[PDB]
Each structure stands twice: as structure tokens, then as C-alpha cells.
Symmetry: D2
Subunit: 146 residues, 4 copies
Amino acid sequence: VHLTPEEKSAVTALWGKVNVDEVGGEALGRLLVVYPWTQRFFESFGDLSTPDAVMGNPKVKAHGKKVLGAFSDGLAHLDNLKGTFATLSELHCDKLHVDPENFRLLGNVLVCVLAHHFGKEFTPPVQAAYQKVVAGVANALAHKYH
Amino acid sequence: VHLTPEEKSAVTALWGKVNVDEVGGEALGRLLVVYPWTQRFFESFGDLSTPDAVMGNPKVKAHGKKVLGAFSDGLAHLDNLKGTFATLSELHCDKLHVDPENFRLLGNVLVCVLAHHFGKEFTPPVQAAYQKVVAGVANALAHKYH
Amino acid sequence: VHLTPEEKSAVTALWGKVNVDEVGGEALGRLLVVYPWTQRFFESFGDLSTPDAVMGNPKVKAHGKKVLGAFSDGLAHLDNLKGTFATLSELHCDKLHVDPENFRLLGNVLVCVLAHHFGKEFTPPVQAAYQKVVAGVANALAHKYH
Amino acid sequence: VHLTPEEKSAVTALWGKVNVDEVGGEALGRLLVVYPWTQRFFESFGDLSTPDAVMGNPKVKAHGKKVLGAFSDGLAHLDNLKGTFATLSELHCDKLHVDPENFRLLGNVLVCVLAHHFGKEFTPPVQAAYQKVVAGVANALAHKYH
Ligand code: HEM
Ligand code: HEM
Ligand code: HEM
Ligand code: HEM
């Protein structure tokens, strides 16, 4: 990832204020609603049969928080997303066999939640910069396939 | 495209409240900022060298109006998108050689721009519903390649 | 999916010399080797942990003959792709939750397999028409998500 | 790009047998036939309106060789794809505005062309490795957008 210094400062000025509970629940719930094939990764979590069921689901909510913590770390290490994510790459690729496309799609969902939460401060350039971050994190997650 | 009763009703309702003059222009502007290669189709519109020149460009705006009204037509014809866009497919495909992937990408941008503006009313099932709509429109635009 | 009368004759002609006991299994196996996440759909098939294991697996080859028969059904009914895949789309989407991207991949794998077996008569236009046919197939298999 | 010592050994021996004057022209040509939107980048090239026009265009073959040669540079330096391609990445991204997806599609075409000229030597593992390699090159060409 390269961010312009104007992009960079903005991107992290905004992350400072992110509610991980709201953003994490919204992001992961919306993945499973918008892209329902993804549910077959979380059969364990229980009831995922409707949007209310997915969104209220406490394990869905709790796992989104953890997902966001990882992105929080990606953020604090944009120079080496590939090392930051090396072990998560091994988990999702070697063991979970998550399709790399789903990494992209969660990324894109995360972006549209942030437009939803960053409000007026979510300008075209701030949007461009977060799309780069979640694309780099996606590529880094899929690294054990490459 | 298949939508359920809930979905369609909230779809059109949210769509009722969209500004005709502003949204297409913000989505078309955002596409060219986030995905800067798409600028190659619009160089005759003027200066696209910075985010500010893309977003403020009057042709980008004015053209975005036509883009938004095309989607509007699509919403009115979800039954027959392929027939609805047959003429715009010839234009984009045979004459302008727009990559199918760019159609997809504008739809995703239009989805974030809705999420940005309608915050809480852009529920997960309404996002799912707009995702299905824009991808349908993208497919029908790409019909000439197929 | 549009082919010219030139296109379909070339395509059907070539299709006639496709070894139906092996091309299917070759494409399924190459899918499984080339994009190893797809293996999560077939864990009841026995040993898949080496290229050799995969390519030898009798249930890969058994299955591929069935895959190949469904592409022949597709090739016969290009004006009725959606309808022709209605039942498989129910299976693959509502029962098996296969990601749509994987339908596209298998298609592309089937393309390189044909090229691998034919040469002489696998002209640039036949390759283009087969890509179209397989993209039509994948889009029909994903119908239930649309 | 990681390759296994067997993949690397096999991949290099195959590339040893590639006609550097022809395979790259066949790739670029088939790209232009199969995914005909890519024709719009080649503004110098004259007539691209039929498959013969694309495949025998002198500039298609001459440019094809340059492309092939750059792929050799990558296959030689698999630990150093970002560096090997930095200058091409500027060109393609900043100056020419080539969509990443198209870098990927050119890769996939090349893979099939190889499949087309090699037969059983083109094992499932060798296909897998080339797909890795070509995706690596696509990602290093798109570096300036990231
Ligand atoms: C793209 C960004 C993503 C990030 C940053 C991320 C992050 C994480 C983290 C931090 C864990 C917890 C691992 C542990 O310590 O044990 C995890 C687990 C998991 N992730 Fe992801 N993930 C991502 C995408 C995906 C996607 C797209 C899927 C599936 C569609 C997925 C499926 C899973 C599953 C199934 C688990 C195991 C959860 C469990 O413990 O039950 N992840 N992920
Ligand atoms: C996916 C939804 C899209 C819709 C609904 C749409 C709709 C339209 C409409 C209505 C026109 C004008 C018809 C006329 O006035 O003669 C048009 C023109 C055009 N569109 Fe699109 N379009 C879409 C996507 C794209 C994309 C992704 C690109 C390029 C990145 C693109 C590039 C163009 C260009 C270059 C023109 C001609 C503009 C001019 O010179 O006046 N469109 N589109
Ligand atoms: C793209 C073209 C595809 C075609 C034409 C196709 C065709 C078929 C057919 C005809 C069946 C029914 C078999 C039977 O009743 O015995 C089937 C089953 C199945 N397909 Fe597909 N398929 C395709 C893609 C995929 C992909 C991409 C996946 C996963 C990566 C997949 C996974 C399965 C599975 C898991 C079954 C059930 C397997 C079993 O229990 O034997 N298919 N497919
Ligand atoms: C993905 C692998 C690719 C490689 C290895 C590659 C390599 C190169 C090379 C070596 C050059 C010439 C550098 C020079 O002579 O100054 C070049 C120029 C170019 N490439 Fe690519 N390229 C790739 C993909 C693409 C794609 C997908 C497109 C468009 C669809 C594209 C469009 C061009 C254009 C328009 C030029 C300039 C042509 C000219 O000089 O007239 N390339 N590429």
C-alpha cells in the first residue's frame, strides 16, 4: 500500500474513532447477508437463516470485533501487511480454505460500512485510501496461495 | 434479479429519496477517484488529474445524471434488464469497449454512496437488495460481450 | 450467450471429439489442484492431498463425467441457459453454497483443457466462443444468487 | 510467488522450450479476440476488427515478443517481481491506465496458450505453478495502483 501523506493522516485520524463493535458486527453480518454462500464458513456459529438472526447473533458480533482488531494491526503496519498477516494467511488458506475472492468482498463490505459510519469525513480520497488498505489486506490474507 | 416484498418496498422508498441531480455524479466521480484507470474513458470531459478536478468536473456531474436515470429505468424494469439495456450495451461494449468489470465496480461505488447518505435506513437486507440490482444492471450492460 | 452460425458449427464439431470419460475429470482435478480452496466442497471424495492423489481419485473422474454432461446440455441449449441449469443452480447455491467465482474458474479450467487436447482446430474464435459458453454456464449456475 | 522445487524445476524446463518469437504474439492476439475490450489500448495498431486482423497484425506479433520477454524476466526473478516490473508498472498504470483485471486476463490467456502448445508435459502441477507465476506478474504490474 502507498498512501499520500494527506490520505495517510486522514485514514488514521478516522480509525482512532472507529467503534469496533458496531463496525465489526455490521461488516461481518453484512458479508453473510449480501454474500450468503459465505455462511458455510460459520455453520458453527448457529442461526444464520435470516438477516435479524445473522445481525443479532452474538458469535457473529464477537468475531467481527476480532476481524477489526486484525485490520487495526494492518493499519499500524502498512509497510508489511504480508508479515503482519502471515499466520492468519496460514489459517484461512491452509486450514479454512477460504476463497481469496471472499477476502476482497469482506474488504468491500468494510468500506461501505465505513461510508455508513465515517459520515461527512468519508470523502472520495478517504474512500480510495481505505479501498487500497482492504485490498492489501486481502492480498496479504491470500498470500499462502500465491 | 429476484427481490422479495420487503426488499423491493424499502428499495423503492430509499430510491424515492435519492437526489437525481447529485448521486450519479458522486458515484461516477468516486469511481474515477477510487479506480483511476476508469479515467481513460472520460478524458474529453476535462481535467481528471486530481480528486478535486474529478469530483468538481461539470461533465462528470452531468453525465452522472444520465447514469442515475439509467439505473432508475432499471429499477422500473427488473423483470427485463437485458431488453432494457440492449441499446446501452451496444454503446458501452461495441463502441466504447468498457470492461465488464468496470460496470461491476460502479455498481459497488453506487452501493457505498447509498450507504454513505442513508446511514441507518441502508439496512443489511436493503444493501443485499441494491447489490443484486446493480450486478443485474452490470450483467445486462455487458450483454453484447456475451 | 451469442454465437454466430460460423461459431456454433466450429464449437459443436469440436465438441464431438471430446473424450467424455476423461475431460470432465481432468478439468475437475485441475480445478482442485490449481485453486486448492475448491477442495472444501469435495472432502467426502477421499484423498486429495497431492496432485497425484487428486488426479487419480476415482470419485473425481466419476464426478467430472457428470460435470461434462451438464456442459454438453448447456452447449445444446444456449438460448435456454438459465432454464437448463435451474435445478443445478438450486443445488449449487441453496444446498452447497458454492461461491459463484468458482463456477467461473471451473469454466476457465475447462477452456485450457480443451486447448490442451485440441490445438489445430482450437482457433482464437473457438477459444472465444468456448469462453462465452462457459461464462454463460457459470452465470446460469449462479442464477439463484441474483 | 512461492513455487515448490518440483514446480520450479518443471516450470523452468517448460519455458526452455517456448518459441520467444511467437508464443507472446499468440497470447496478446488471443487476449484481444477473447476479451475484445482490450483492443482499445492498442491505438497505434490499425485494423483489429476480425480475428485474422488481430492475430496477423504485425504490431501484435512485435509487441507480443516484448511481453513474452518481460514474462521471462519475471520467471528469472521470482523473488523480485515488484522490482523487475516497477518500470513497467509505472508505464501501464500511471501513463496508460490499464485495468489490473486485464493484467490477470492476459496471464490466464498465456496459461492456455502454453496448454495449447505443450500437451502432457503441461501437468496439473505445472499449470498450477504457471497460474501462480502469471498472477504474481499481474500483481507486480499493478503495484502503482496499490
Ligand atoms: C479479509 C479480512 C479478514 C480478516 C482480517 C480476518 C481475521 C480473522 C481473525 C482475526 C480470526 C481469528 C483467528 C484466531 O486467532 O484463532 C479469523 C478467523 C476466521 N475467519 Fe477470518 N478474517 C478475514 C476474512 C475472512 C473471510 C472472508 C472468511 C470467510 C468467508 C473468514 C473466515 C474465518 C473463519 C471461519 C474463522 C474461524 C472462526 C472461528 O474461530 O470459528 N475470514 N479471521
Ligand atoms: C453500469 C452502469 C452504467 C450506466 C447505467 C451507464 C449509462 C450511460 C448512459 C445513459 C450514457 C449516455 C447515452 C447517451 O447520452 O448517448 C452512457 C454513456 C457513457 N458511458 Fe456509461 N453507464 C454505465 C457504466 C459505465 C462505465 C463503467 C463506463 C467507463 C468506466 C462508462 C462510460 C461511458 C462513456 C464514456 C459514455 C459516453 C459519454 C459521452 O461521451 O457522452 N459507463 N452511459
Ligand atoms: C461450472 C460448472 C459446473 C457444472 C456444470 C456442475 C455440474 C454438477 C452436476 C451436474 C452435479 C450433480 C451430480 C450428481 O447428481 O451426481 C454437480 C454436483 C456438485 N457440484 Fe457441481 N458443477 C459445476 C461447478 C461446481 C463448482 C465450481 C463446485 C465447487 C467448487 C461444484 C461442486 C459440486 C458439488 C459439491 C456437488 C455435489 C457432489 C456430490 O455429492 O457428488 N460444482 N455439479
Ligand atoms: C500482464 C503482462 C504484461 C506484460 C509483461 C506487459 C509488458 C509490456 C512491455 C514490455 C511493454 C513495452 C515497454 C516498452 O517497449 O516501452 C508494454 C507496453 C504496453 N502494454 Fe503491456 N504488458 C502486459 C499487459 C498489458 C495489458 C493487459 C495491456 C492492455 C490491455 C497492456 C497494454 C500495453 C500498452 C498499450 C503498451 C504500450 C504499447 C506501445 O508501446 O505502443 N499491457 N507492455
